[PDB]
Amino acid sequence: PSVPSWKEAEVQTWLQQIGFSKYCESFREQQVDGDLLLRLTEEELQTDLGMKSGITRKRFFRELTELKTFANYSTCDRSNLADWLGSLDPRFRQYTYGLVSCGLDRSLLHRVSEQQLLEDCGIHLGVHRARILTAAREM
Amino acid sequence: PSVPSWKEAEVQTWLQQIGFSKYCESFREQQVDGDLLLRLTEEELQTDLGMKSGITRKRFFRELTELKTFANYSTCDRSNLADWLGSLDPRFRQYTYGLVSCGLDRSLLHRVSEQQLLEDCGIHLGVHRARILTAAREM
Amino acid sequence: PSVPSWKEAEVQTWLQQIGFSKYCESFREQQVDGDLLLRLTEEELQTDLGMKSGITRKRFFRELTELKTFANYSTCDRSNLADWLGSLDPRFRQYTYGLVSCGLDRSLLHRVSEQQLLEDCGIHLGVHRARILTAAREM
Amino acid sequence: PSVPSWKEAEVQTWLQQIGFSKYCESFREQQVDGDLLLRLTEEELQTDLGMKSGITRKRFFRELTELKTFANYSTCDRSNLADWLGSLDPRFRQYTYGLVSCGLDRSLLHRVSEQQLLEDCGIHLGVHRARILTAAREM
Amino acid sequence: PSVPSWKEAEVQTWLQQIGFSKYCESFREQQVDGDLLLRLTEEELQTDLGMKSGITRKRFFRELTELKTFANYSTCDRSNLADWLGSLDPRFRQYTYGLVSCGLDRSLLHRVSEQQLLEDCGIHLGVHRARILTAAREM
Amino acid sequence: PSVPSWKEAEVQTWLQQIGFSKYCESFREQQVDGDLLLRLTEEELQTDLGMKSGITRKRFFRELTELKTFANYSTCDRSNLADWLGSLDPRFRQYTYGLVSCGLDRSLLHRVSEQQLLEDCGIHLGVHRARILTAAREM
Amino acid sequence: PSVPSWKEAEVQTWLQQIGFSKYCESFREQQVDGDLLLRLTEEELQTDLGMKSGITRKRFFRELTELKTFANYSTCDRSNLADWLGSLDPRFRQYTYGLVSCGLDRSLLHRVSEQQLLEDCGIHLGVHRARILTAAREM
Amino acid sequence: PSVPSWKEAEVQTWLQQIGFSKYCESFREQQVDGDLLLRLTEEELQTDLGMKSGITRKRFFRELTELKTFANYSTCDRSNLADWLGSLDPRFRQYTYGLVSCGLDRSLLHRVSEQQLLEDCGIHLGVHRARILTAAREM
């Protein structure tokens, strides 16, 4: 909760909680705060955060998805896209920060393309992208 | 059975059972649990798990397919896709975890594309993908 | 005969018979049994089995084709595709294991594409693929 | 404010303010003034300014976006595109210098293509590009 | 004559006859018999047979074409494609083994594509391929 | 003024004036006169003139654009394209030498393609190219 | 004259005549006779004949074109394509050996494609290929 | 004048005249005569003539263009394309040798394609190619 407003110290605490204390050192070197944590990628992990293991990256991204599914986005979500995504599918709430970081709100969702969701918003599952796109044009 | 809920120790036991004790060490280094075992790939095997042999990877994937064909998915399969796939073909039950990990259930199967099955769900045989796709549009 | 049920020792015996005792050592290192022998490729030979000679790979694949032409597939061929392929052409019987390993039987042959035969079933001769495809749509 | 008219010293002061004193040295080596600061890229940062961290580049670009959102463009913006972009979206004001550096004003915005916005004007978010393009053809 | 049934020793004798005694050693290392001689390629020559000279490969392929033009194919040519090709053009008789190795006979020639002749049958001259294809559809 | 007729010494004087004395040495090594200065590129700068800095290349090209905007082209501009470009936009006068070096005059401007402007004339801004092309077809 | 029947010694004599005695040694190493001389390429020259100079290759190909323009092809030209090509253009007689080596005669010239002339016959000038093709369809 | 008939010594004299005495040595090593001088390229200069400077190559090609503009082509230009090109544009006379070396005369100019002018004739400016092509179809 209030992950978007997390500073570096909260990231260290969460990394210690989820079993990534070694990479807690690495993150503290790179000054990763809540915004950068919520907008992290595979390439950034590999090049900057010392995560050279694909399996360990998968476990970390599972834990990051778990954190994004239960985060509080009241600070950044004016249109309240979090419950919209959750109503679509409870596991779709993890895309809230990716959507709002693009400037997207509930109003302009109907003009969002699949390429935009893939690239600018960071939704990588084609099955998930289709369901979000389908509901977007429905409204 | 209950492979989706396996921790690391069950993976070690299964690896010892199927003749991969050397790679049991390697898996224990990479902390592979049941979810990661069911969602394993060739690239992950090669880069992270020390399996540099294509023939040995083939034998391991045969044994993994055997395990996925007889696994219990009651924890993760709410729509019970396992018996649906088995009714399609008894050897199609191995794709249950790949399908449910995508968020797919019995309801949205008719909108699944072949590209989605190839990429997001991990079905690599084109013959198998066509039969699943054909039955999906039939219902 | 009963090549699909061959263990490693039968592979060693056959390799000794066909003049590949040096590679009999290499195969025993890689634990190649009958299923892996029938599903072998050029890339697997080169990378895993020490066969760095293209000419020697050609001779080995001639001998493998001879073995596949006279193998007994009663264990794996429920629809009895072996005599169907032989009736098409006596040299087409070598593709029986490649076809049945895909889950294909006599019923679904009419929906098989040329891309599927090339990739999933391993038929590499375009002339052979066309004749199999032509007879498939005929029935 | 008056970022477009900043010399090197103002860049050093801003870099010290935003937590980039080490890179303040690097910028002073490369003589980066306000125009070059407003027209900076990822490639220029990496090759010329010693910023080898993708995460640190992300933080720097967040701070650069914050500075561009509140800069005064009265010197270079004759048609006053800054308030036009702000009326479109308050976070769109950061593109003012990229647009005016191309010679664009309010008059010729309706002939601007998406490729032009991506390449010549430096707008990298596809979602942002679409909204600017949509409003451009509207007027 | 009876080149398709040549063993290694006949290949050594022919290589000595045509001025390739050094490469006679190399061929004896690679166990090239009549079938492999008739189905030889540029890549196989370079990688396996020590023929690193393009000019020497050209001379060897001239001599191989001369041998294929006057070989006896009674053992392998049931439909007697040799005189058919010779009637088309006396220099077309060299393609008999390439055609029959594909399983092609006089009956199925009308369904043979140019891609098939280029790849599976090994006819590399586009002018020669067109003339064979033209006569194939004529009958 | 009279930049097209500048010899090497005037280039040295201008380089000293604009803050590039180190590269004044480098230019004097490469014998860059006014014609070569007006027809300079990024690749030529990097490979021949020691300008390995992208930021420094940007500053140099700003100063080169300033010089081209106020140069006198009476020697080479028979059709007087300089005031035509200036009437289009005062910052378009920098393209005069690039246009006249191609042999272009006011008469044949209507047949000039965008590819020609990009490649032969050296106009790299797509926004600038479109405006020049639009006015070209207008007349 | 009678270049198609030249052995190695005549090639040495011609090379000495045309100023390539050093490469006369190189050719004698590679056993280049008249047929190989008339069917020589740039790649063969570079890789096998020690001609690493593009300018020297150009001079050698000028001299080879001069020799091919005045060669006697009575041995190989049954349809007498040499005077046909000469009637088309006196400098087109150099393509006689390239055409006849493909099996082409005067009869089948009308079915020859531009791709065939470029690849199988070795005519590299597009202007020359068009004129030969145009006259081919005319007859 | 009479550049097409220049031997090596005239090339040395011209190179000394135009300020390329160092490369006069290099040309004398490569035996560049008038025909090779008139048919020179960037790649040949770089690889064979030691001209590793792009700027120096540009100056040399300016001087070569000046020489080609005032050369006498009476020996090679039977149709007198030189005055035709000069009438098109006085700076188009430099393409005379490139055109006549292709076998082109005034008669077949109307069938010349832009690809042919770019590749076989060596006209590299798209603006120049279009004007030559336009006048070619006009006649």
From Swiss-Prot, chains A, B, C, D, E, F, G, H:
Effect of residue 96 to A: Does not affect phosphorylation level
Listed result of changing residue 74 to A: Does not affect phosphorylation level
UniProt domain SAM: residue ranges: 6-70, 80-139
Result, substituting residue 13 to A: Does not affect phosphorylation level
Tissues expressed in: Predominantly expressed in brain, kidney and liver. Expressed at lower level in placenta.
Triggers of expression: Up-regulated by lipopolysaccharides (LPS).
Subcellular localization, as worded in the UniProt entry: Cytoplasm; Cell projection, Axon; Cell projection, Dendrite; Synapse
Residue ranges crossing the lipid bilayer per the database entry: none
Effect of substituting residue 58 to D: Reduced ability to form an octameric ring and promote axonal degeneration following injury
Impact noted for substituting residue 125 to D: Slightly reduced ability to form an octameric ring and promote axonal degeneration following injury
Known outcome of mutating residue 48 to K: Reduced ability to form an octameric ring and promote axonal degeneration following injury
Entry text on domains: The TIR domain mediates NAD(+) hydrolase (NADase) activity. Self-association of TIR domains is required for NADase activity.
UniProt record similarity statement: Belongs to the SARM1 family.
Protein function: NAD(+) hydrolase, which plays a key role in axonal degeneration following injury by regulating NAD(+) metabolism. Acts as a negative regulator of MYD88- and TRIF-dependent toll-like receptor signaling pathway by promoting Wallerian degeneration, an injury-induced form of programmed subcellular death which involves degeneration of an axon distal to the injury site.
Subunit structure: Homooctamer; forms an octameric ring via SAM domains. Interacts with TICAM1/TRIF and thereby interferes with TICAM1/TRIF function. Interacts with MAPK10/JNK3 and SDC2 (via cytoplasmic domain).
Protein name (Swiss-Prot/TrEMBL): NAD(+) hydrolase SARM1
The organism's taxonomic lineage, starting at the top: Eukaryota, Metazoa, Chordata, Craniata, Vertebrata
Gene that specifies this protein: SARM1
